[PDB]
Design a protein around this nucleic acid. Sequence first.
RNA 1: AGGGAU
Length: 92
Amino acid sequence: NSADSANDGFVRLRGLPFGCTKEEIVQFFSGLEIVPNGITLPVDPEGKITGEAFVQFASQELAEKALGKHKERIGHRYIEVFKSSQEEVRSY
RNA sequence: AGGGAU
């Protein structure tokens, strides 16, 4: 066993450069894969991201591989890879 | 508009 509150490829990002998007999350996980339109980016009234995001990797197995990117960097800043579930990304 | 240990 490796989880107790999730069983899907859903995950969460934080530490984002306030300018990262689907294209930066996917290059950050370019050694991995993500499902089509599987990324979401909450924003403020200003239309700028809250500093965190949500994704759906290819099933719960891919999400667990992406956890190796915890505290890893996107190019000049470090990122985090908390887990998630549909109940945090159902904004679809 | 920060980090937050998650």
